[PDB]
Input
Amino acid sequence: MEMTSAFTLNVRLDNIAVITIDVPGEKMNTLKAEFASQVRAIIKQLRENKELRGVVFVSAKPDNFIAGADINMIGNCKTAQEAEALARQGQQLMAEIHALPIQVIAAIHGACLGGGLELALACHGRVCTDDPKTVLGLPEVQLGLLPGSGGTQRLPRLIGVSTALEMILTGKQLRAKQALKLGLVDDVVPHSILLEAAVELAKKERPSSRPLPVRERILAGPLGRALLFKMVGKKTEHKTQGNYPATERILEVVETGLAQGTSSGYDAEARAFGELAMTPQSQALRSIFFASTDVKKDPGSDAPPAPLNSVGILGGGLMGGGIAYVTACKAGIPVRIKDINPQGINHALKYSWDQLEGKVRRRHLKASERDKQLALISGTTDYRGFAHRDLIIEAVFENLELKQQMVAEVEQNCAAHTIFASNTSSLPIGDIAAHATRPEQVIGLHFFSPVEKMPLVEIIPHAGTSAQTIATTVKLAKKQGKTPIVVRDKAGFYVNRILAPYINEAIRMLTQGERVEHIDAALVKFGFPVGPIQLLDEVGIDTGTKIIPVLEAAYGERFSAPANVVSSILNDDRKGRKNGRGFYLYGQKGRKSKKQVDPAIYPLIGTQGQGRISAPQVAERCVMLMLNEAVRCVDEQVIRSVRDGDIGAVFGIGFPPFLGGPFRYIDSLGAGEVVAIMQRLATQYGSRFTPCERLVEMGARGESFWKTTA
Amino acid sequence: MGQVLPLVTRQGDRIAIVSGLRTPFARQATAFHGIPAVDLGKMVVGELLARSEIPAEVIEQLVFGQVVQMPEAPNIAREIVLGTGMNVHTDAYSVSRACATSFQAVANVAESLMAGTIRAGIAGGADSSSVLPIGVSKKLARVLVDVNKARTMSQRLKLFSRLRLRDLMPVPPAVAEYSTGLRMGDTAEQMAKTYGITREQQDALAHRSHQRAAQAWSDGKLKEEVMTAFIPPYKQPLVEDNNIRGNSSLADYAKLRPAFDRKHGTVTAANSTPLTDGAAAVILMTESRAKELGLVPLGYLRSYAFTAIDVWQDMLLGPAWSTPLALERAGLTMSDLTLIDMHEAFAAQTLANIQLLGSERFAREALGRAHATGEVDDSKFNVLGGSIAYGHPFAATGARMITQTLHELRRRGGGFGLVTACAAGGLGAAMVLEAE
Amino acid sequence: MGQVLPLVTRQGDRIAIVSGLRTPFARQATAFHGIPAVDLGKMVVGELLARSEIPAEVIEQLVFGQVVQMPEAPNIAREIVLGTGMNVHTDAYSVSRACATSFQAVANVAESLMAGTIRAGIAGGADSSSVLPIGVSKKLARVLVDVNKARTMSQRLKLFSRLRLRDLMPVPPAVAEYSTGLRMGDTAEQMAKTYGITREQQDALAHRSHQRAAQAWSDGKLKEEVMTAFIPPYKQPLVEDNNIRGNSSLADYAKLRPAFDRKHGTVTAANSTPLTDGAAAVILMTESRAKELGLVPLGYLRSYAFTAIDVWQDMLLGPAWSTPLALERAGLTMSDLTLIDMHEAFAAQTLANIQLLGSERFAREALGRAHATGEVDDSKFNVLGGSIAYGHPFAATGARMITQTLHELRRRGGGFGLVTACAAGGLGAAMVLEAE
Output
């Protein structure tokens, strides 16, 4: 009620206080500055009553116990003082919370992250339910950030250093079962008696009298902390390429906290916000998170959805099994597949079988439920039983006549309510539809190399496509755990259109006598993880090459690769890992290490010249070509929104997140500032680096593609 | 109505029979080796349900069965419904009837739909000859009981003191009648000696059953009823029965050592069907429901018949007992009976049955009937062959013939079917079918 | 409208229960030690025939199910009639449904005499915890499969290579749900944490049932249907139920540590049915033939009800689900009930069920009925004690409640009996009896 905030004090008949966290606004139990203020007033009224003996803390929300700090106030920080102050006000409260002598218990249910574990470490006892929704962690390093207070110092000596460091660095997700045996949560109790199970735990005489000892007590002290620190730091820079801050910073803030006492970490972590919270890496990560969250909230279309509980796939192989895998393992929807040859069925069922039972092999799952999703795996070689598939999806060869014939016959072999979709390679969805009885229910999806790693899809409606067909299609990826992006039905599209200059330039550069390892290491040093050629082969040389004639027939000659060199590898049985030989060594006889490329590709290439071009120069050229294409593709508005365009590139191609993305890079690099040096590159090599007219428009007059707020 | 009884429901709808699906049968070593009986039931039920448009929430009751029982999961019916996608509130059960559990369920399923509590059912079962559970020696079963209830450590070593002999050697499986010790071939042999069946008289039935069945495979008539099996190895699917050998001449396996007597054993392993592995599921559901959801049933149903006789001689003559009773309970006769079927569990043991069916003396006194039940022609008898070809899983051949005949009557374009089957314990199974 | 199932035959004769008898029960490792469950089958029925003097040939069907099945007897029903003096031509069989096989038999057999193919039936069963047919590790069974199929003597030793010292360890028995792993006490336990069941009320029920059941034995009311068992060594007969602790106090119950969850559970051995052994045999047959041969039935039959629910959470709520549906089919009410009974498997799930039978909100969304079931009066509830006293012999539990009530409603006015019972797999059994 604008005064009650969320923390409500409740005194039962006994001498314990039960505390409920009911945020009046959003369903999550997030953190605001005023909560920290009134709870000090709340704890003040609790301190005056000497009758109480303990306190227990309740989620008061089926969604979560406490969500954590809200990123918007971090975005509202202006300089080091505010960033330091929020940490400092976090310390004194959490110190004040920890200063009480009576037993303090917090009951965890739902989510408890970031600022969630802030209070958890401030309680002597804690219980989390066995319900599989509960989770604990510090998802702060991802944002280029770190916990507000206490996390770097009081968590490490309560649970250990090795677990604490990786949790702060790797940022994994912790379950109730593994938190219990690790020792952070004293007991896991049923959600039904969650509040009452903490009642007697509040009645326990000891707040902390026999803390758990350390089996790994061997390195407790200064003898091995530095040896650990030097090895983790050396791996960190080797893993982080040095372009991510708040990685070595974690080593510093923890070391000062561990060595010279608690008070040092308090100022040190307060100071960490002074520089780290105000950093182009930090703002880039904070902005992209809001960009990422919004599109998940964004429902793509406007029409109401339609019933969808049966899906039909026409085509198996490996992609058919993979797409079925997620829709089965994650989405859990009934599915039917028809293949004219059971070998595709047999392999695809094997294919899903392959990815499965590895979680079982990891002992985190058992075969009892494993067979359950095997049941929904349905395969056949006939049209019978397909009459009640809500959606029909095409996974057959991209022959348009073959596509048009099957889409024509599948309508006769399926319900009218069923909507047809296809993962076309280059054929337009409207061209694919053509003689379509229900074109409005004909739509286009676009997937990639195995998407268990890749969380993105493309939405490709054609001229006639009912908004319900889009709305139904868009909501699929959300329940598929993917991000929906609606793109225009144009040749080359968005992700593939900007990826071609990324690889075409890599092909163009390396043929001029440049070693791949040096350009690769610098490029992954720059902020593109995994280099061009290794990406080029394993994704499919031909499938990357197949769009090029379509791209060349779409816009211009710029997409062209050097002739008779990229194609020569294709008709050489040197077709990547799928063919067992390509670029990188595929025998992997070097103790499964980073094997250097096959020492025979170099003679096949002309490779005339030397390095010549600088290591950052190829990196700035690689980003520019996609950037030159990024503004170009969005120039005809291939993307619905700028945020969709930004989110599409950084998670679909691999632009440095610390740089924020393509147009995060543009405004960071003085907006139209890069144009001149980009234009100089155009003078250096050729008009392939011509500025876009809108890029010229915004660059010449001085503009940012984002009015927004800055 | 002195002999015929109605088989129509309370509401006036006949007990319609809808199609089913068959797992192809393979020998205990060629295929289906190590695959339990659970997933076979899972394998058939999931695809048969998800092959037509029939939903899973509509079903209210079903039963499978297995003559070979795995000790784990005593109620096999629970596992099938829970994993394969059906309503979690379905009435699943399991029944026992050696070699005819399919037909046992058919009566059990029909009686459930007779009451009106349930409107639709699913019938089938699983049988496997390669996952036989091994029991311990009986002596090394009481000893393990005491040790769990033992209190002190000193008592245990005293308990172990009586462990001796070859108790470590387990108990190999046995099939002969437990209280009779008859191996179903030795009593099948004595019939041929009792009723005069020659190894030349047989071994052409074995050939003619290998024929007219491989031709069915060659004609591909049994296409939509036999599944293409897939395995967790996924090495390759199976399409055709491998036990069936409708290519060897009848004069090839006649020079084989007798299976049981080995002295004057006019039957051998070749002319006796071998145990094979597979499963099946069939849809049984009332006439009105079939129409009110718009489904034509794969024919209809007429009646049922089963008989029990003393287990000391010629126990596999239950069909000889059962045959007239089914026709009287339907008010029918072999004359008005297009095509028949026999389980043909062995060489002979049915040649006598058709002989007994045609023998006036048997039905005169052994049954009290005024007349014999009549003779039957070979042409309308096991047209698709029988057990001597594909093989004989115990509880599965029941519904399998149901599938073969109804479609065959669909091939015959109507008529009334009839199947006869002998069962362990002097039991016979017979009934009149109707493809409308 | 009225969804009522009239339990009257084609001719209109209602289904009648004429009589039955119960084998007395003893704990595991007691006088009932090492006795095969099949032997209990003969003994319970053989004396019942003689005491009844009903002919052994007039019976035309009978089914006894059993928990703790043994593979030595696949079809136990055939063995009993082959063991007992009843006619070999009876066409019997066996079924299995959790701890309510007695009620499972009640369902599928009452419909058997509804068909008109038969006229009379026998109900009962036998399960014993002192006997377990335990086998070796599964792969060891798999190993023995190849050696029987092996052809080369030198190949066997290569097959013997795969072994370990722990292999000769056999697999201990299990009771938790196979696909769930939750023991039955655990699910009863989680309800005590879910809805709130104090140990004091659970232990009080253990006291009340002990006080009630011992009083019935002290009153000797359960005498004419309780057998005087003889053990083949013939040392001394058993007359009374030794499981019942009628000399007990609630304080003795509270000093027991919780068995399953030793942390904060509210169930112990005091408030849990112990492992008891025994048998049962009850006679069911239509009223018309009862008057045809001149016999008065010990009551009659009104309706039946069974439900399938979730196993993950609150699996013992079958009686909570099944209660209104039975009174729906009977067209009756919980108020219209002289006496009520429910299988006191656990005192926790006991208090849970009656509370849920009285929970109006339970029937609003889980069931959607017009109104909840009603209030279960403790006075009529388990008047002769319950399962926390006599024990849980698994299969016979259903019939044993059938025995007491029909006598008890014979001991009182005709009334209308009712029993409810939970079962494994999210199964609950409920029905309304008449008892005239």
In short: DSSP finds 14 helices and eleven strands in chain B. Residues 101-115 of chain B form the longest helix (15 residues). Residues 46 and 85 of chain B are 7 Å apart (CA to CA). Chain B touches chain A through 17 residues (CB under 8 Å).
